[PDB]
């Protein structure tokens, strides 16, 4: 689905998750991902 990160509750960062933030889901499919500290 588009956007995504709603159920996960995180931000949609493209490319890869920037540390120390950890990935917590995906966004727009596989191009963007969800990233959160907790």
């Amino acid at each position: 689905a588009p956007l995504s990160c709603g159920r996960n509750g995180g931000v949609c960062i493209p490319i890869r998750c920037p540390v120390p933030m950890r990935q917590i889901g995906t966004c727009f499919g596989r191009p963007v991902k969800c990233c959160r500290s907790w």
Side-chain angles (χ1 to χ4, degrees):
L3 240 61
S4 324
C5 240
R7 228 245 66 92
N8 312 88
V11 282
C12 290
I13 311 188
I15 309 203
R16 48 108 57 168
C17 211
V19 296
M21 196 156 274
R22 135 185 50 85
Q23 238 156 243
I24 50 123
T26 45
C27 284
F28 291 92
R30 312 257 70 97
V32 199
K33 286 146 228 79
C34 280
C35 281
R36 219 171 63 208
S37 350
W38 66 96

